[PDB]
mmCIF file with all atom_site columns, C-alpha atoms in Angstrom:
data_model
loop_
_atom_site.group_PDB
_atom_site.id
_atom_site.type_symbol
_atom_site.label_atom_id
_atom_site.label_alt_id
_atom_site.label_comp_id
_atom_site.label_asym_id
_atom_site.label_entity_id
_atom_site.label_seq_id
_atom_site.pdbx_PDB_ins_code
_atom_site.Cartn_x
_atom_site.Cartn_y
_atom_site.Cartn_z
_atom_site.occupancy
_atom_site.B_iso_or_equiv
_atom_site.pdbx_formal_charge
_atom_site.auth_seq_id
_atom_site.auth_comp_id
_atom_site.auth_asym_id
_atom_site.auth_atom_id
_atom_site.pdbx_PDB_model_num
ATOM 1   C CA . UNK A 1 1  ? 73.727 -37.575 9.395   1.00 24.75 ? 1  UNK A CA 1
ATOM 2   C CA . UNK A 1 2  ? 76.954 -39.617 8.391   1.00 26.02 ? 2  UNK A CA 1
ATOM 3   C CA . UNK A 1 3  ? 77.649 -41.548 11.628  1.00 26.32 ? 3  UNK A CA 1
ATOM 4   C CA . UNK A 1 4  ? 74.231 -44.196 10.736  1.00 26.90 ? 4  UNK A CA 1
ATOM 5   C CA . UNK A 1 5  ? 73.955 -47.066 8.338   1.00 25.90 ? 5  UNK A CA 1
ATOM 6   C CA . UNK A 1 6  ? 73.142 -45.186 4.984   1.00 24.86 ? 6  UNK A CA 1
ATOM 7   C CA . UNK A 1 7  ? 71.665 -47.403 1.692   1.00 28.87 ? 7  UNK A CA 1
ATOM 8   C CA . UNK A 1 8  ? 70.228 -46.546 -1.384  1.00 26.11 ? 8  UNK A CA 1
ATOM 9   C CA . UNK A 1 9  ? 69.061 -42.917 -1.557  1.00 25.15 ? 9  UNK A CA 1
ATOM 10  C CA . UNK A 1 10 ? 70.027 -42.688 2.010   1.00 24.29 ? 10 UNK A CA 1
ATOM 11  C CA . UNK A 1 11 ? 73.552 -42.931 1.242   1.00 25.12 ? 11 UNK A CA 1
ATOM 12  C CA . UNK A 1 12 ? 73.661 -41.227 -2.374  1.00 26.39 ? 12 UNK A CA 1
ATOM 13  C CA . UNK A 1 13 ? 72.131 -37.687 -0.312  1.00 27.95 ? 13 UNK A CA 1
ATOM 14  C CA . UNK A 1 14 ? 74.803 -37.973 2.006   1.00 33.39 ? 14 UNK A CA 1
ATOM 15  C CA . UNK A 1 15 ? 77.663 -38.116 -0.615  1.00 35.82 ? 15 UNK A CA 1
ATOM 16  C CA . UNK A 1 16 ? 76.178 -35.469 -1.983  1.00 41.01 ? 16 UNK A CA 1
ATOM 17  C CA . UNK A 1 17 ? 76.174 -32.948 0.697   1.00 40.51 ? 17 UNK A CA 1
ATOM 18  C CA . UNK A 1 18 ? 79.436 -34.156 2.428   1.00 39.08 ? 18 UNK A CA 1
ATOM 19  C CA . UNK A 1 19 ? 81.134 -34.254 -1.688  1.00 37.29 ? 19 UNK A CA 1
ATOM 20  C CA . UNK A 1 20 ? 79.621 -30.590 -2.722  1.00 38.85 ? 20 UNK A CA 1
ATOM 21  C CA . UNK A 1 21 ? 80.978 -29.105 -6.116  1.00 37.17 ? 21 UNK A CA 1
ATOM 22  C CA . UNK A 1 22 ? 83.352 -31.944 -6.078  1.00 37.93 ? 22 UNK A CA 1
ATOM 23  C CA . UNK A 1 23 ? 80.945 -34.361 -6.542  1.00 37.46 ? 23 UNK A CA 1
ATOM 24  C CA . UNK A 1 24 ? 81.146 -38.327 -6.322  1.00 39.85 ? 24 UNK A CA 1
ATOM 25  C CA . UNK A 1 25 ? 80.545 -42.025 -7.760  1.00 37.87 ? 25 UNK A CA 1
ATOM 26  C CA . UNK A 1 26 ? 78.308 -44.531 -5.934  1.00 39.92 ? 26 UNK A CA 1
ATOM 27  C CA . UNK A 1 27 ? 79.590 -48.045 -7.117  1.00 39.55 ? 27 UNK A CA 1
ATOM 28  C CA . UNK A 1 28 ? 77.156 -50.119 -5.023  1.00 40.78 ? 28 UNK A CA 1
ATOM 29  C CA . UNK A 1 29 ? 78.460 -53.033 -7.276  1.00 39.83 ? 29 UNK A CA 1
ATOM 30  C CA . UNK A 1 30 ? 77.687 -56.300 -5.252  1.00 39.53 ? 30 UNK A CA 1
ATOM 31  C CA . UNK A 1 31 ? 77.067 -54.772 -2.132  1.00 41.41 ? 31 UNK A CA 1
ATOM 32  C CA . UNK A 1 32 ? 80.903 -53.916 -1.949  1.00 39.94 ? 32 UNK A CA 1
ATOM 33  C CA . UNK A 1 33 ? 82.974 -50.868 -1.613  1.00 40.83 ? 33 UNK A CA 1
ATOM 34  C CA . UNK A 1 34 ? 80.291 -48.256 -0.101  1.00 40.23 ? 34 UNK A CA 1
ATOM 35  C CA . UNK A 1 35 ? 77.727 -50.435 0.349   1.00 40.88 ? 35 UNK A CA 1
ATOM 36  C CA . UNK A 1 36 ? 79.688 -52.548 3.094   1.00 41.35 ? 36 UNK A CA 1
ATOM 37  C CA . UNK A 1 37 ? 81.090 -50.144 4.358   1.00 42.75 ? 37 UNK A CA 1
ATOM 38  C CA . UNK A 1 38 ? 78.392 -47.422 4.910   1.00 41.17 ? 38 UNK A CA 1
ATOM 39  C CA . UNK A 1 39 ? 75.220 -49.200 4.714   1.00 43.21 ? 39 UNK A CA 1
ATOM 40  C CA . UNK A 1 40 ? 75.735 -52.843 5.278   1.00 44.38 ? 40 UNK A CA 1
ATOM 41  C CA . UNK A 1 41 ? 78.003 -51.171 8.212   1.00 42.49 ? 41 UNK A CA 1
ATOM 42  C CA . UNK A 1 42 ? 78.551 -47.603 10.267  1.00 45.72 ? 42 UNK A CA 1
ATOM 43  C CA . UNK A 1 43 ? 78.998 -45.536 7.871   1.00 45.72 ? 43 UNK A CA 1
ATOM 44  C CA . UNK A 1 44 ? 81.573 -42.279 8.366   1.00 46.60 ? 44 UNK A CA 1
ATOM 45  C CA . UNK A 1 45 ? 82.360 -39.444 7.211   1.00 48.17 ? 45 UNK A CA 1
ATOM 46  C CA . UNK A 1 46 ? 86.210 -40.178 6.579   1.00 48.87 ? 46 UNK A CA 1
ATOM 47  C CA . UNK A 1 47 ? 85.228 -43.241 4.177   1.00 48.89 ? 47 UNK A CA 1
ATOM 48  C CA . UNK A 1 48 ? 82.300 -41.378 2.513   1.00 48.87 ? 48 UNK A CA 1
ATOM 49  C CA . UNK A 1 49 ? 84.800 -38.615 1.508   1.00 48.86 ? 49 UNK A CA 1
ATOM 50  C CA . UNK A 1 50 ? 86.810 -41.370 0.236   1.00 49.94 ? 50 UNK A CA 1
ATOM 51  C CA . UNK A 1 51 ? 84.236 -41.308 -2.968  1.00 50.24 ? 51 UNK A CA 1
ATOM 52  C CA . UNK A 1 52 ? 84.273 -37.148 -3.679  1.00 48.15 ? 52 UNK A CA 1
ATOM 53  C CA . UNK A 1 53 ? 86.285 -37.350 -6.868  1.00 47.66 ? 53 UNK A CA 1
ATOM 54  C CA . UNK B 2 1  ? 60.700 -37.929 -13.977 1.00 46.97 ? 1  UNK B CA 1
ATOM 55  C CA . UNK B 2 2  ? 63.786 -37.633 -16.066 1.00 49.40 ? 2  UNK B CA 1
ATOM 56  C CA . UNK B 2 3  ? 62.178 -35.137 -18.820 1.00 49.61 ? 3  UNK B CA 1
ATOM 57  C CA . UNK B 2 4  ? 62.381 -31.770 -16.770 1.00 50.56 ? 4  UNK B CA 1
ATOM 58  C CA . UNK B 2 5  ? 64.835 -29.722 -15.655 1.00 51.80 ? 5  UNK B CA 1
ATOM 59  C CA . UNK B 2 6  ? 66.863 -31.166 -12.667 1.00 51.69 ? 6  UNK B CA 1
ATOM 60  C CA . UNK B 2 7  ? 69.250 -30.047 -10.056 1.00 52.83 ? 7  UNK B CA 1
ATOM 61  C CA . UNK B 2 8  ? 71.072 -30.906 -7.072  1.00 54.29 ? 8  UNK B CA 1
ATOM 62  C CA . UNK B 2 9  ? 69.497 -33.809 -5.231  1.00 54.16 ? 9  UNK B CA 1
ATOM 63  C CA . UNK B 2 10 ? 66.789 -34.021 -7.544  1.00 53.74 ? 10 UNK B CA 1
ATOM 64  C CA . UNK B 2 11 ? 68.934 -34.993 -10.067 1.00 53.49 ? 11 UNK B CA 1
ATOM 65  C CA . UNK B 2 12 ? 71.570 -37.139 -8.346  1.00 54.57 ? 12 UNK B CA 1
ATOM 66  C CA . UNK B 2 13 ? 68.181 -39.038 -7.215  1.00 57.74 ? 13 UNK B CA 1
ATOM 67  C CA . UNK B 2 14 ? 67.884 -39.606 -10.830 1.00 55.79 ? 14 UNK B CA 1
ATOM 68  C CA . UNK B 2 15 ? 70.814 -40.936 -12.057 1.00 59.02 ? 15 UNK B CA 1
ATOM 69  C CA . UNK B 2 16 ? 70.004 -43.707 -8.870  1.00 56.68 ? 16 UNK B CA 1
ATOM 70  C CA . UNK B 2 17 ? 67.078 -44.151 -10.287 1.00 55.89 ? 17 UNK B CA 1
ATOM 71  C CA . UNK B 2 18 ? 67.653 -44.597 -14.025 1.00 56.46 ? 18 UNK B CA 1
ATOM 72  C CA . UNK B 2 19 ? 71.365 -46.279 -13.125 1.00 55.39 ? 19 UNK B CA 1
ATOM 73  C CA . UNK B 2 20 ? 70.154 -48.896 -10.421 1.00 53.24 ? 20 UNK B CA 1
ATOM 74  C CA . UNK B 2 21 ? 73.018 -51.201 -9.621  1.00 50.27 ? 21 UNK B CA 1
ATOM 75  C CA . UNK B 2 22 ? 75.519 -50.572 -12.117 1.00 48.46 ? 22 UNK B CA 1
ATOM 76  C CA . UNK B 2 23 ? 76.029 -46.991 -10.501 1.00 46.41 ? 23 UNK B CA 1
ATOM 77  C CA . UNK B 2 24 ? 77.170 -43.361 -11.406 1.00 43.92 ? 24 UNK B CA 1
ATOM 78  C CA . UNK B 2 25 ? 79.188 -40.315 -11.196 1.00 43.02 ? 25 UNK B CA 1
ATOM 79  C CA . UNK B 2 26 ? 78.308 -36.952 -10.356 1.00 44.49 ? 26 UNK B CA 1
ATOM 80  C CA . UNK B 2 27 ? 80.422 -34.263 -11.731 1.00 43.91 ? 27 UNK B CA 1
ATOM 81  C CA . UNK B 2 28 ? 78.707 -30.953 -11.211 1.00 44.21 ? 28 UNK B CA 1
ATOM 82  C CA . UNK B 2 29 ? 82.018 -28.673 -11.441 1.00 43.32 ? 29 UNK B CA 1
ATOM 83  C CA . UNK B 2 30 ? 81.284 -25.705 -13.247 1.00 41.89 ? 30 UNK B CA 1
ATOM 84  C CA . UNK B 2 31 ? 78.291 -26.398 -13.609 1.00 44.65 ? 31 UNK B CA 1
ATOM 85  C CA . UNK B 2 32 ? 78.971 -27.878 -17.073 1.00 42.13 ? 32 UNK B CA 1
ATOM 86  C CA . UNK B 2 33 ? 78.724 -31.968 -17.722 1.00 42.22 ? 33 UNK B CA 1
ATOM 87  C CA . UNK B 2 34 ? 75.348 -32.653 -16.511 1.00 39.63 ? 34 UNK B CA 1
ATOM 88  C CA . UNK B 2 35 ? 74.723 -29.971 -15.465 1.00 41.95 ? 35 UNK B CA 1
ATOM 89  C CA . UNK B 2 36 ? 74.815 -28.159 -18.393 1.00 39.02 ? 36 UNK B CA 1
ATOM 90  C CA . UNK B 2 37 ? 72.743 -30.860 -19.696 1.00 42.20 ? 37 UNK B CA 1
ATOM 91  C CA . UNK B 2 38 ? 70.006 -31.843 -17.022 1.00 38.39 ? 38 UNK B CA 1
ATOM 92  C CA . UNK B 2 39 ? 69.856 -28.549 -14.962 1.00 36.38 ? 39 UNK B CA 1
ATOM 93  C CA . UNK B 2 40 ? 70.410 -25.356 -16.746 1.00 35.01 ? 40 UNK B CA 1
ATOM 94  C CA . UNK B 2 41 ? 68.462 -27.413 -19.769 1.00 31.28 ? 41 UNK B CA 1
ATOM 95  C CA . UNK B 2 42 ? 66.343 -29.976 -20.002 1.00 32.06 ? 42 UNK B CA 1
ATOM 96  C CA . UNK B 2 43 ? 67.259 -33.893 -18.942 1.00 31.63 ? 43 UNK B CA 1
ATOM 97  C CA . UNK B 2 44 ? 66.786 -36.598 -20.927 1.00 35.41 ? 44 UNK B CA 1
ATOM 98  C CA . UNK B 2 45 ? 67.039 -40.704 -20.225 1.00 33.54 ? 45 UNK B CA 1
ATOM 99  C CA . UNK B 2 46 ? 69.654 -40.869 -23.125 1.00 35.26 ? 46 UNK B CA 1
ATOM 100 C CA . UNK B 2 47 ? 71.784 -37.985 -21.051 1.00 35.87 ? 47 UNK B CA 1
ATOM 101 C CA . UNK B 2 48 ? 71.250 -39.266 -17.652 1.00 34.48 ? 48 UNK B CA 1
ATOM 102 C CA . UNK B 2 49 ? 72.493 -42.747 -18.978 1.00 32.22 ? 49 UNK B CA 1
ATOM 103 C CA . UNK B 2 50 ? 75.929 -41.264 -19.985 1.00 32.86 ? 50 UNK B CA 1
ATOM 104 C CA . UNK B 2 51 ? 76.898 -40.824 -16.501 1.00 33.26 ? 51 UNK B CA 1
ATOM 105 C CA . UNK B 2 52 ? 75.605 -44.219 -15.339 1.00 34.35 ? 52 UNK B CA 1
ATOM 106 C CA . UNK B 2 53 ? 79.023 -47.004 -14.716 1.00 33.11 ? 53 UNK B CA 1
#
């Protein structure tokens, strides 16, 4: 489920089940940081774990 | 949708919800924080807010 563009609630349901108890932030913030890189792009699971705290 | 209780996805789809662009954190560990607030009792807008960006 990680290796796919991911937006929106797409994307927030997959931090959450990669992040678990450690939970995360989703700073879509002019379509930078996660968004390019996940939705607006591949996403993968090495870059969404870069947003479990 | 933000005036029951709420947990796990259903309340990280929430806080996308109610938080929109400016974004969120999700800090479920030990099930205090939100948690606390939104799950185990009753969620609020005011509550869900305090976790928007």
């Amino acid at each position: 489920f990680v290796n796919q563009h991911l937006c929106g609630s797409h994307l927030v349901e997959a931090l959450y089940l990669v992040c678990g108890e450690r939970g995360f932030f989703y700073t879509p913030k002019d379509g930078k940081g996660i968004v390019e890189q996940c939705c607006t792009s591949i996403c993968s699971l090495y870059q969404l774990e870069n947003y479990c705290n």
